[PDB]
Structures are given as structure tokens and as C-alpha cells.
């Protein structure tokens, strides 16, 4: 999980002006829409039956913000992704039984949303660093299967 001293700054540069309130629920909302089998885990979240329904569902947003925080916690501690997501790996792997394929997927729709949010400021330089972060998070969250 390397991320050059430039890339690390290329990442908080960007994450400084992320909209904690709207980004997280947005990526989680599109995930459910683009990979519909992922609503299996959200039986308690109310109505998800049409793209508009998902986008405005208030739990997707709320839960979405909490999930953002994990990534925030991951950006602050990049040399110890395991420890930071240790217990969070247990929840998904040992209790929710989410396939870690889907951790890759959420990360990628998160990159998309950031592209969508920052537009041209999300340079190929920047994207490639964020791919590194999302892989390590997606992967450190998948340790309880290793």
C-alpha cells in the first residue's frame, strides 16, 4: 500500500474538500443501483426499488456517512490499514458474510463519485493514488478471510 509522499498529499488535498454529508450515501446508493445483488444486506433499510427511491432513502445517506468515516480513518492511518479495519473486517466477514469482491466494487464506485464531484480536478494522477487507497482499504477489510 505505497502512495508516494506526493500522492499522500495528492489525496488529502482532495479529501479536504470532500462533502462528508453527501459523498458517502451517494456512493453507497449507486452501488445498490449498479450492483443490485448488494441490497441483500440492506433488508432493514426500507424502499430501494427504483433509483430515485435509493437516492433519497435516508438510511443509505446516514449509513453512507458512517462508511465515509471509515475511509477518513483509513486516510489518517495509511501504514496500518489492518488494525484500523480489524474489527470492521470481522463484521463483514464473520457476521454479514459479504464477499470481499464487493469491497473492491464499493471502492470503485467511490472513485466514480469523486470523479463526478471533483470533475477535472480528479486528475489521472489523483485517481491512480485513490485507487491505491481503495485497494488497501477494500483488501484490509478482507483480512479475516486471509
Amino acid at each position: 500500500v505505497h502512495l508516494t509522499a506526493e500522492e499522500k498529499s495528492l489525496v488529502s488535498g482532495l479529501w479536504g474538500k470532500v462533502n462528508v454529508d453527501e459523498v458517502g450515501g451517494e456512493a453507497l446508493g449507486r452501488l445498490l443501483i449498479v450492483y443490485p445483488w448488494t441490497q441483500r444486506f440492506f433488508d432493514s433499510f426500507g424502499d430501494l426499488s427504483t433509483p430515485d427511491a435509493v437516492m433519497s432513502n435516508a438510511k443509505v445517506k446516514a449509513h453512507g456517512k458512517k462508511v465515509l468515516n471509515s475511509f477518513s480513518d483509513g486516510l489518517k492511518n495509511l501504514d496500518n490499514l489492518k488494525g484500523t479495519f480489524a474489527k470492521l473486517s470481522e463484521l463483514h466477514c464473520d457476521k454479514l458474510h459479504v464477499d470481499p469482491e464487493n469491497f473492491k466494487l464499493l471502492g470503485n464506485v467511490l472513485v466514480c463519485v469523486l470523479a463526478h464531484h471533483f470533475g477535472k480536478e480528479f486528475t489521472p494522477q489523483v485517481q491512480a493514488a485513490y485507487q491505491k487507497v481503495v485497494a488497501g482499504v477494500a483488501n484490509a477489510l478482507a483480512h479475516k478471510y486471509h
Binding site: 449507486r30 443501483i33 449498479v34 435509493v54 466514480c112 463526478h116 494522477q125 485517481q127 491512480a128
Partner: protein, 141 residues
């Protein structure tokens, strides 16, 4: 699949893309190279530098292919036959790199078209790129 809903979204989107299509193919390719260094390996013969004209030029040909695809959605298989052969028989591209370039093609469009890139359109485009890719790998099967 490729339900008239998605066909409408792909077609509709490729339209506001306009002349910027070839330009995107280049940026998309650029994007795949930086994010997934594993991939540059199909292009040992390319300068993969910052301004590369080869990279610029290749992207036009990739962007042209996707427009042929948009123009023939109820028959991608026949439309793309020459590329199926090329990407399977000759280049032996890994099925896993269509997923990789497809993601980067999706990022490209987000970056440039913030309005059109709604969730529903974002899923429709995903279908379309997976479809194109399904067909390019179609010769290992």
C-alpha cells in the same frame, strides 16, 4: 439486458459526448495506465509518456469502436468480430483488463459530464461497457 431504458441512456449520453469521444479514449487509456500499471504491459511498443501521440491516437481508435457499438446495440457480436479476434487470438488480453479499462472509461465520463452522469445512466453505461467487453473476451469461450 440492454433494455430500451439502457439503450436510451447510452445513446442519449454518447450524443452529448459529441466530438470529445476520441479525446476521452485517450484520457481513459491514460487513466488505466497510471492507476493499473499492470496494464501498460500490452503496449511495450508505445511511448506511454505524458503527451504520447500514440496513446492519443490509439484512444481515437478505441473511441471509434465504442461509437460503432453504440450504433449497433442489438448486434455487438457481429459489429465487433474483428476486435474479438484481435483481442483474443493475437493480443490475448486478460478478461480482467476489460473490467479495468471499463472502470476508467466510466471515470472519464464522470469527470467530464457531471449532469448526464446520473445513477441510472451510470448503470446503463456500465451495462454497455460490460457488454462490449463480454464480446471482446468472447473468443475464450
Amino acid at each position: 439486458v440492454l433494455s430500451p431504458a439502457d439503450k436510451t441512456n447510452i445513446k442519449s449520453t454518447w450524443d452529448k459526448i459529441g466530438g470529445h469521444a476520441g479525446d476521452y479514449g485517450g484520457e481513459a487509456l491514460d487513466r488505466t495506465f497510471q492507476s493499473f500499471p499492470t496494464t501498460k504491459t500490452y503496449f511495450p511498443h508505445f511511448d506511454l509518456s505524458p503527451g504520447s501521440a500514440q496513446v492519443k491516437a490509439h484512444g481515437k481508435k478505441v473511441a471509434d469502436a465504442l461509437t460503432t457499438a453504440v450504433a449497433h446495440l442489438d448486434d455487438l457480436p457481429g459489429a465487433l468480430s474483428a476486435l474479438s479476434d484481435l483481442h483474443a487470438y493475437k493480443l490475448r488480453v486478460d478478461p480482467v483488463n476489460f473490467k479495468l479499462l471499463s472502470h476508467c472509461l466510466l471515470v472519464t465520463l464522470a469527470c467530464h459530464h457531471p449532469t448526464e452522469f446520473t445513477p441510472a445512466v451510470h448503470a446503463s453505461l456500465d451495462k454497455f461497457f460490460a457488454a462490449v467487453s463480454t464480446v471482446l473476451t468472447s473468443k475464450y469461450r
